[PDB]
Amino acid sequence: RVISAPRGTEIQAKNWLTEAALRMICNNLDPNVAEDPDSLIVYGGLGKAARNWECFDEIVHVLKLLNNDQTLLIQSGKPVGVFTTHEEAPRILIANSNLVPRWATWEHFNELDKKGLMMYGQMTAGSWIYIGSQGIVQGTYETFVAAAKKHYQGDLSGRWILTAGLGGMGGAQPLAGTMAGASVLAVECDRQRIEKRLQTKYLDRYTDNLSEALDWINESCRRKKPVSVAVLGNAAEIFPQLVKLGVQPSLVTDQTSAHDPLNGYLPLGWTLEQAVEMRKKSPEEVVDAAKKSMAVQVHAMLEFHNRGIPVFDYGNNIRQMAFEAGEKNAFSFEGFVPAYIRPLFCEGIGPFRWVALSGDPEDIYATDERVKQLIPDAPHLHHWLDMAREKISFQGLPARICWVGLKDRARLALAFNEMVKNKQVKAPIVIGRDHLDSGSVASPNRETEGMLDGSDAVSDWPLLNALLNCASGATWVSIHHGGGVGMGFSQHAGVVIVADGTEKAAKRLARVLHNDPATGVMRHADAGYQIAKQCAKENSLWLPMES
């Protein structure tokens, strides 16, 4: 079967709110969107839109029948019950992959999955708001722009980024970096992955000659004309060579699969084929050689850091692996979350995502221009919107992501609702986000690692986020376990609300798009961040325990 979101202005559901849910679950399985839709897999290996095909078919059946005062419960991708609520409550409540903590393991998940009892929601797979690769590209752009703002007055022209890994997430770095105004040198050991990124226009050039790569980079930095270059090789060899050469990248990071020393990171001096064979004969030797290689790479990263260059981790655990392998100074440079993302979270600045249910790209282009009107002094935002139009291809329903703070989300949502009402877009707009927002994630090895107060693992917050978005009038609300970092390691919440042009939706939008980022300002003010405390006061939040 081939699934895609219905289009245009005719609806099959009883109203546009449940029509939106119908379109969004189908869009998650669009062959231009999903990684393996035949198995209902949206992204992330096992992130599914529904538990199985019987469940998918029944979800579609229920969504077309739900009245505006009925609410469907989704339990790990299964439509288990419909109950009467009211028009100002969500039409769907979703809880995916949640396991009592001592059972929150892949071993138990798999046992339950084999019995037909489980589904992995990842983040946006089980909660029907996945929009393809734009999420990763935009998020990587956001990080590079945050680094540019912090270190270079927002200007990367004539500068270049050194990184490694062109995989499922790392492959976004060339495009994100050049969109951000920098040239990019990315080390990658798999030639087939390089060739794929070349074919799909995610990468400009590659070579196995490091000197040639540098001459290309320097020529582009001279011309102030960003280029992306992949060097075929091993980051544990190339990074120390670049240190020895005295070259001057303006940002250094890494997205090798360092989190997986057995199956991910290629040891120094090994071929891909040798790694394949050694994993079958001697897994412990593979792990040891990989971690020792990571220590060599991190030692080089530290030398750039010692020379005053901004160096940051990109959430792949490479510092801890290198530390364990003997690089005792591994943590002298920061992770990208505490350095760049958490300060944005402290102002409720986070992923703001919207989807044109009409299917018409002109709907998104109209909303792009409107965002630029509403936030006129934001060059990195305007540049992103302009560059996304020509560089980012829509997948399934046209959609857009940008990062928007507590001060502005509701303004944008209400403007979108007005555009639906006055026909400046052809059909209603779905507004949501991934689950990685200021108030909606507890993930002590990633987004809440190293909180000032040590509250990394407190998961009250995403549960309150979901309950409050339910209370506030979101169209569907989701509570998920284990997205990104796997079973046992995160708890997070999603929210989607439909702007259908009505005054009733306007009231809901004004609450949800304020309250949802405000919970993140609250959460970070609670942890002690003055940036968040200041933001709370600027937005007149009622935080009873805050002075």
Query: Annotated binding residue at 44?
Result: yes
CB 104 within 8 A of CB 96: no
CA 251/CA 421 separation, integer angstroms = 45
Judged by phi (left if over 0) then psi (alpha if -120 to 50, else beta), residue 48 lies in beta
Minimal distance in Å, beta carbon 389 to ligand NAD?
24
Query: Annotated binding residue at 265?
Result: yes
264 lies in the binding site for ligand NAD (CB under 6 A): yes
Bridge-based pairing state of the strands 92-96 and 476-481: parallel
Q: Which of 11, 92, 162, 189 binds ligand NAD (CB under 6 A)?
A: 189
165 lies in the binding site for ligand NAD (CB under 6 A): yes
- The distance of Cα 28 from the centroid of its chain, to the nearest Å, equals 15
The size of the interface with ligand NAD (CB under 6 A), counted in residues, is 26
Q: Which stretch binds ligand NAD (CB under 6 A): 181-189, 200-208, 281-289, 381-389?
A: 181-189
Q: Which stretch binds ligand NAD (CB under 6 A): 160-168, 218-226, 242-250, 455-463?
A: 160-168
Among candidate residues 55, 221, 402, 535, the one labeled active-site is 402
CB 120 within 8 A of CB 152: no
State which residue, 71 or 293, has the beta carbon closest to ligand NAD: 293
Nearest to 399 by CA among 137, 173, 178: 137
DSSP state letters, 102-130: GG-SHHHHHHHHHTT---B-TTTTTTT--
3-class DSSP string for 127-167: CCCCCCCHHHHHHHHHHHHHHHHHHCCCCCCCCEEEEECCC
Q: Which of 256, 358, 367, 475 binds ligand NAD (CB under 6 A)?
A: 256
Q: Which two tokens stand for residue 429?
A: 């707009």
CB 475 within 8 A of CB 498: yes
CB 448 within 8 A of CB 460: no
Minimal distance in Å, beta carbon 339 to ligand NAD?
13
CB 429 within 8 A of CB 499: yes
User: Torsions phi, psi of 169, nearest 5?
Assistant: -105, -40
234 lies in the binding site for ligand NAD (CB under 6 A): yes
Q: Which of 154, 168, 338, 486 binds ligand NAD (CB under 6 A)?
A: 168
179 lies in the binding site for ligand NAD (CB under 6 A): no
Minimal distance in Å, beta carbon 448 to ligand NAD?
12
CB 460 within 8 A of CB 444: no
Q: Which stretch binds ligand NAD (CB under 6 A): 168-176, 216-224, 414-422, 509-517?
A: 168-176
Query: Annotated binding residue at 255?
Result: yes
Minimal distance in Å, beta carbon 320 to ligand NAD?
11
Considering only residues 190 to 209 of the shown chain, the ones binding ligand NAD according to CB under 6 A are 190, 193
CA 270/CA 292 separation, integer angstroms = 13
Q: Which of 164, 182, 364, 495 binds ligand NAD (CB under 6 A)?
A: 164
Residue 44: CB atoms within 10 Å:
18
- 402 is known as an active-site residue: yes
CB 165 within 8 A of CB 203: no
Q: Which of 316, 417, 459, 491 binds ligand NAD (CB under 6 A)?
A: 316
Beta bridge partners of 71: 83
| Residue nearest ligand NAD, CB atom distance | 167
Query: Annotated binding residue at 266?
Result: yes
Minimal distance in Å, beta carbon 177 to ligand NAD?
13
Q: Which amino acid is at 367?
A: T
Question: For the range 381-384, what are the long-range contacts, defined as Cβ-Cβ under 8 Å and sequence gap of 24 or more?
Answer: 383/179, 384/138, 384/141, 384/145, 384/179
Q: Which two tokens stand for residue 64?
A: 């077309």
CA 128/CA 250 separation, integer angstroms = 38
State which residue, 168 or 488, has the beta carbon closest to ligand NAD: 168
Minimal distance in Å, beta carbon 197 to ligand NAD?
10
State which residue, 278 or 414, has the beta carbon closest to ligand NAD: 278
Query: Annotated binding residue at 170?
Result: yes
Q: Which stretch binds ligand NAD (CB under 6 A): 259-267, 277-285, 357-365, 398-406?
A: 259-267
Convert residues 441-480 into a mask of x (bound to ligand NAD by CB under 6 A) and - (unbound). -----x----------------------------------
Q: Which of 90, 261, 315, 396 binds ligand NAD (CB under 6 A)?
A: 315
Query: Annotated binding residue at 503?
Result: no
232 lies in the binding site for ligand NAD (CB under 6 A): no
Residue carrying structure tokens 């929210």: 495
Q: Which of 97, 163, 257, 490 binds ligand NAD (CB under 6 A)?
A: 257
Nearest to 72 by CA among 122, 128, 34, 118: 128
Minimal distance in Å, beta carbon 445 to ligand NAD?
9
Nearest to 235 by CA among 174, 291, 313, 164: 164
Query: Annotated binding residue at 122?
Result: yes
Q: Which two tokens stand for residue 377?
A: 């002094």
- The distance of Cα 308 from the centroid of its chain, to the nearest Å, equals 29
187 lies in the binding site for ligand NAD (CB under 6 A): yes
Minimal distance in Å, beta carbon 210 to ligand NAD?
13
State which residue, 138 or 257, has the beta carbon closest to ligand NAD: 257
Query: Annotated binding residue at 257?
Result: yes
Query: Annotated binding residue at 138?
Result: no
User: Torsions phi, psi of 284, nearest 5?
Assistant: -65, -40
Minimal distance in Å, beta carbon 318 to ligand NAD?
8
* b/e code 246-261 from CB counts within 10 Å (16+ = b): ebebbbbbbbbbbeeb
Which residues are part of the catalytic machinery? 402
- Known binding site: residues? 44-45, 122, 124, 168-170, 188-189, 193, 234-235, 255-259, 265-266, 314-315, 353, 446, 484
Binding residues for NAD(+), as ranges, are 44-45, 122, 168-170, 188-189, 193, 234-235, 255-259, 265-266, 314-315, 446, 484
Interacting residues with ligand NAD (CB under 6 A): 164-170, 187-190, 193, 234-236, 255-257, 259, 264-266, 314-316, 446
